[PDB]
Amino acid sequence: MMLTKELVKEAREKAIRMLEKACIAITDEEKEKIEVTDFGLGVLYTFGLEILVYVNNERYCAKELVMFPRQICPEHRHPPIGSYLGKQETFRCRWGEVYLYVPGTPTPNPRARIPEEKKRYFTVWHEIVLRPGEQYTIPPNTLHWFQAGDEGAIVSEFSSQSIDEKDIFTDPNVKR
Amino acid sequence: MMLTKELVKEAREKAIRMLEKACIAITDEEKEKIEVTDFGLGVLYTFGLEILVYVNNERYCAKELVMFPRQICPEHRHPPIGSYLGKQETFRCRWGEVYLYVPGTPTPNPRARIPEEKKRYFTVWHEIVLRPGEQYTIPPNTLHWFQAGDEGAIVSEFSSQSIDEKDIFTDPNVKRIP
Ligand SMILES: [Mn+2]
Ligand SMILES: [Mn+2]
């Protein structure tokens, strides 16, 4: 299965509707530029993310992450690059709910549900549940992953410079 | 007149309602912590701002600025501090509309309406109108001010580290720290 132009358009339209439902104004030019990634894994609705970048420069970045129901962001970390410390980010759930996993003691009875054969590539299990208004901050170079709840989620990212191409994923099949 | 605890509570409640109308979730703990400033000028509803800080650290900052109808943020700039370049910020109008003024050729027929006797302390007049979804970025140490439209405005800030206490205002009557 492959990320086609038709799948991308469908995903953009779904994400645009979710943003509208959450009352988040988006320009026509931004609507066209929403990034759709299946992380190269060919199952967008299982592993994938729809991203609106508000601003990204050498000094700060802000994005809106849209997630369809139970969409999963595969495990990654944002490493130092040259003398750049690496991206630190704060997430704020805006709508729906998200299950975020970071290093720490495994939480019993985690909310996330991962395909059995992909569990090997999820290694952190300390759970943070974020509902609308709630936040959490990930230091640079820290492993993390997240899955939206059964209605999906919109999660804001506020961070230092983003360099998506340099992110390191646990799953060696991922191409960002 | 001075900013009392009752005036602060009233302003917080109004700003909370405006956030709810814009569907922006805020926690009970954030409701108590919204900053209300009249910039020390004693006319909150003319000059003033209601601020929710989402995050502010050495590496980045994000805030929600709530503005009542025609509330004005007095002219200031975010200067370098030591070796810190100074705050760069991007504004994004979320709701309502805002009239932002930056250095440049004065725009004829500006939308803003400033009290006659305070005009002397507004020195930049190049107009940027932001409606919901629209953004503008102010480089560090750049003079700027803004006024909300007749329905008010909610404006997001995304920026490098914020150090409000170091901001320099054109109006010498302003005290940022209440
Ligand atoms: Mn991340
Ligand atoms: Mn400013």
Numbering used by the authors:
A (entry chain AAA): 0 to 175
B (entry chain BBB): 0 to 177
Q: Would you copy out the relevant sentences from the publication that reported this structure?
A:
Here we present the biochemical and physical characterisation of a thermostable lyxose isomerase from a Thermofilum species (TsLI) which shows high thermal stability and is highly specific for the substrate lyxose having little activity for other sugars. D-lyxose isomerase (LI, EC 5.3.1.15), is an important aldose-ketose isomerase reported to catalyze the reversible isomerization reaction between D-xylulose and D-lyxose, as well as between D-fructose and D-mannose and several other D- and L-sugar substrates. The overall fold of TsLI is a cupin-type β -barrel, with two α helices at the N-terminus, followed by the cupin barrel made up of two antiparallel β-sheets. The conserved manganese binding site is located within this pocket and is co-ordinated by the side chains of residues H75, H77, H143, and E88.
The structures of the native TsLI and the D-fructose and D-mannose complexes have been determined and refined to high resolution of 1.7, 1.4 and 1.6 Å, respectively. There was strong electron density observed at the conserved cupin metal binding site, which was identified as manganese by the metal coordination and metal ligand distances. The metal identity was later confirmed using a X-ray fluorescence scan at beamline IO3 of the Diamond Light Source. The β-barrel forms a deep pocket that is predominantly hydrophobic. The loop containing R175 in TsLI does not appear to change conformation between the non-ligated TsLI structure and the structures of TsLI sugar complexes. The dimer interface of TsLI is largely hydrophobic and contributes to the enzyme stability at elevated temperatures. Most residues at the dimer interface are conserved between TsLI and B. subtilis LI, however in TsLI the respective F157 and A61 from the neighbouring subunit form extensive contacts, where the aromatic ring of F157 sits tightly on the side chain of A61. Furthermore, the two monomers of TsLI that form the active dimer are connected by a disulfide bond formed between the two cysteines at residue 22 of each subunit providing substantial thermostabilisation. The disulfide bond in TsLI is sufficiently buried to hinder the interaction with reducing agents, such as thioredoxin or gluthathione, allowing the disulfides to maintain their oxidized state.
